[PDB]
C-alpha cells in the first residue's frame, strides 16, 4: 500500500458519530478534510486529471488552466505537482495573501485578474489563455466534467456503504458543483440498490435549487458559506436523485462549525457547519428517528483562520 | 467503522513514494498530516487521555493542564473536546494570534504567561495551577509519559509494517519527544523482529543527541525546525534503539519542504522537510541503494502559513 504519487492517496476518509447533534447518535460525519490537500476536492482534482489523461486530452507537455483558487484550485495544484504538469490558475487580484502564498507554494502559475471583474474576469481570462493555444492548454471544467461526480460514485459513495455496513438511510451534502451528492447518491441507490434520502444543502441567502424545484423565480444572493451556493444549477447536480433540499443561513452554519470544534473536537470548515445544521434539523424529526444520517464535512478549519469562523 | 468520537479516528495514515528524492523510489513518506487535528500528535493526545482514564488519573470532572500550544496542545484540545474534559493550556503571551484563535476555537481555557518568561514561564505556571488543586488538575507530560511512545508501538509502527509488507529497511524520524522513533522502532525491531536502521533527525543548530552519543559537551541553540530540537534528551527517546543520527540545518529543511510542495504535491510542514533531507542523504549512499526508507512527515503546510515556509 504505497501510492505512486499523492493523487492516488485520495479518500478512505473516516466516519465519526456526533454526540451533541441528532438523537441517540443518528448523525454521523465523513471527514473530507483527511485528504492530500485537505478537502473533498482532492478526489476530483485527481480524477479529472486521470480522466483527461486516459482520453488523451491531457498529455505530457500540455498545461492545465482553470478559473479557481478555492478548494478545486488547491486540489489541482497538488495533482499537477504530483504528476508533473504546469498549471495556471486565474483569480481576482483581491484574493487572500494566504491563498496566494499557498498556491504559489504548490508551484502554480498564478494569473491575477482585475479586482473589479471578480469571478467573471477570471473565467474569461482562463478561456482567453486556452483560446490562444488550444493544443497547449486544457481546462477541466469542474461544474460540468463528469469525472467529478464519477469519482464520488467510485470512492466516496462505496466508502459510506462499507463503513455503515449498508445501514446508511440519509446522505446530507452541501452543493457546490453537485458532484458529491450526485456521485454518492448514484452509488448507494443504483450500485447498491438502497432507497436512501438524498438531501442537498444550500444557503437560504441563495436558495436556487429550492426556487428551481418549486418553479419560482431564481434569485441568487451573497452568503458566507464558502464552497456552496454557486448561484445557479451546475450540470454535475443530478436533480433526479435529490429527494429533499434544506436551506441554512450563514450565521447558523458558522455557529454550527464552532460547535463542532468546541463540543465534538472536529476541525471542520464553514460548509461543514451548514451541512450538520441541516442534518441536525432532519435528525430531530420523528420520521428520521431510527434513520442513520451521514453528512459530508468538505474541509478542515485551519483553511478558514482568516475568515469569520474565528 | 464508525468512530464513537474523533479521538478514535487517529492514524491509518498513507505511504506515498517520492519521485524527486532518493534513488529509484527508495524513499517513501508517511503523511501524519492526515489526522483528526492534522498532526502526528493526535495519536498521543488520544492515547495519553485514554491511558490516564484507564489508570484512574483522569476521571469525569477533572481538568487537563498542559504547558503547550504546539501540535500537542492542538491534539489535546481536540481530544478534550471530543471526550468532554475542560482543558487549560499555558503559553507565552507572545504566541501567534492564529494559534490563539485555533485553540480558543477548540474550547481551550487559554492561560497566557509573561512574554519575558517564555517556555519556562508557561511550564512553571502549569505546575502552579496543578499544585493549587492536585485532585482537580492533571498534567499528562508528553516528554516522559510512556503512553506517548506506546501509541506509536501499537499503531504507527504496525501501519508501516503492513503498508510495506515487511519490506521497510530504514525508518527516519525527527525527534521532539522521541515518541515516534521509539515506538515505531520497538514495533518493527521487537514485535516484528526485523533489524532495520532507526535514524533520528535533529537540527545541526541544536545537535544534542549527536553531542550526547559522542560524549561531547551538550550545547543547544535556536533553529526554525518547529516540532524538533527541544535542546535536551527527552525520556521518551529510547537511545538504545537509535542506530544513527542525522543533523539538518533550518534553511535546507525549509527548502526541502518547499520542494515537497512544488515537486511532489505534498503539503508538509517544516520538520517534514528536515526529515526528508536526512532521508535523501541516506538514500544516495550506495549502502542504502536497495533499501526501502520510510520517513515520518509530522504535519501539514497550512499550519505554517504565517511562518518562514511561505
UniProtKB/Swiss-Prot annotation, chains A, B:
Keyword vocabulary terms for this entry: Allosteric enzyme, Amino-acid biosynthesis, Cysteine biosynthesis, Pyridoxal phosphate, Transferase
E.C. designation(s): 2.5.1.47
Modified residues (N6-(pyridoxal phosphate)lysine): 41
Keyword Amino-acid biosynthesis: yes
Cofactor(s), by name: pyridoxal 5'-phosphate
Cellular component terms per the entry's GO annotation: cytoplasm
Binding site for pyridoxal 5'-phosphate: 71, 176-180, 271
A biological process term (GO) from this entry: cysteine biosynthetic process from serine
InterPro entries named in the record: Cys_synth, Cys_Synth/Cystath_Beta-Synth, CysK, P-phosphate_BS, TrpB-like_PALP, TrpB-like_PALP_sf
Stored PROSITE patterns: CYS_SYNTHASE
Transmembrane segments: none
Molecular function per GO: cysteine synthase activity; L-cysteine desulfhydrase activity
NCBIfam families the UniProt entry points to: cysK, cysKM
Assembly with partners or alone: Homodimer.
Name of the protein described by the UniProt record: Cysteine synthase
